[PDB]
C-alpha cells in the first residue's frame, strides 16, 4: 500500500464523540496532532455539552492506531497506516466488570490534509452508584500491551485486552476489551501476523481551561516480531 507515506511528518488530527451513557448524552471534540515516526500523540479533548458524565480515563482506548510506532521490520505489519487514507471502521465493546458496557463505532480516516476519529458511542445497564457514573476512578492511565491477530475472514484485524482502571479506594477495575478494524476502501490492506501494541499515555490538565477537559500524551510502539535473520 501507499498509505504510510501520509504519516512521514506531524499530522493534524480531529475528534469528534457522540455519546449516551444510560441516556446521559454528552459530546466531546478535540484536536492536536500525531508524529508516527515517533509513536506520540498530543491532544486536548473538551466536553462541549458542559460536565462528562463517565470518568475522563474510560474514553482514552475510544478517543487513533495509525499513529503507531511501527519498527522498519515490522512495516509491512501496518494494518492501520496501510487502509489510508480511505480508512478504517473501528469497533469495541468495553465491558467493565460488576458494571455494565459500552458499545463504539468509530471512522478513522483522512478529510484533507487532517486525520478524523468521528465515533458514535452508546452506554448499557451502568450502575448510577458504580465506579463509572459514580466518578470513582483516579485521573491517570497505566502501561499496557494489546496483542493484534489478523480476521482473514473480513480483510481486517481483531484484538481483545484488559484495561485497568484504578480506583480511589486502592482498588482496580476491568475493563474488558472486544475490538474489531476492517477497512473502508476497497484498495488492498496488510493482514499483519500476530503482534502486540504496546501503550503508554500521560494525563494533565490545562490551567488556563475552565471546561470539562483532558490533555493527552499517549505513546503507541509495534513489538512481538522477532529481528534476526535480515
Not at 156 to 180: C, M, P, T, W
Request: aromatic residues 8%; proline residues 4%; glycine residues 10%.
Amino acid at each position: 500500500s501507499k498509505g504510510e507515506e501520509l504519516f512521514t511528518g506531524v499530522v493534524p488530527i480531529l475528534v469528534e464523540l457522540d455519546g449516551d451513557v444510560n441516556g446521559h448524552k454528552f459530546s466531546v471534540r478535540g484536536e492536536g496532532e500525531g508524529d508516527a515516526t515517533n509513536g506520540k500523540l498530543t491532544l486536548k479533548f473538551i466536553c462541549t455539552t458542559g460536565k462528562l458524565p463517565v470518568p475522563w480515563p474510560t474514553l482514552v482506548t475510544t478517543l487513533v492506531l495509525c499513529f503507531a510506532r511501527y519498527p522498519d521490520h515490522m512495516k509491512q505489519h501496518d494494518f492501520f497506516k496501510s487502509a489510508m487514507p480511505e480508512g478504517y471502521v473501528q469497533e469495541r465493546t468495553i465491558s467493565f466488570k460488576d458494571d455494565g458496557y459500552y458499545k463504539t463505532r468509530a471512522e478513522v480516516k483522512f478529510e484533507g490534509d487532517t486525520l478524523v476519529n468521528r465515533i458514535e458511542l452508546k452506554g448499557i445497564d451502568f450502575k448510577e452508584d458504580g465506579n463509572i457514573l459514580g466518578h470513582k476512578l483516579e485521573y491517570n492511565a497505566n502501561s499496557h500491551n494489546a496483542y493484534i491477530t489478523a480476521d482473514k475472514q473480513k480483510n481486517g484485524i481483531k484484538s481483545n485486552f484488559k484495561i485497568r482502571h484504578n480506583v480511589e479506594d486502592g482498588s482496580v477495575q476491568l475493563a474488558d476489551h472486544y475490538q474489531q478494524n476492517t477497512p473502508i476502501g476497497d484498495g488492498p490492506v496488510l493482514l499483519p501476523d500476530n503482534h502486540y501494541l504496546s501503550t503508554q499515555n500521560a494525563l494533565s490538565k490545562d490551567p488556563n481551561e475552565k471546561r470539562d477537559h483532558m490533555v493527552l500524551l499517549e505513546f503507541v510502539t509495534a513489538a512481538g516480531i522477532t529481528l534476526g535473520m535480515d
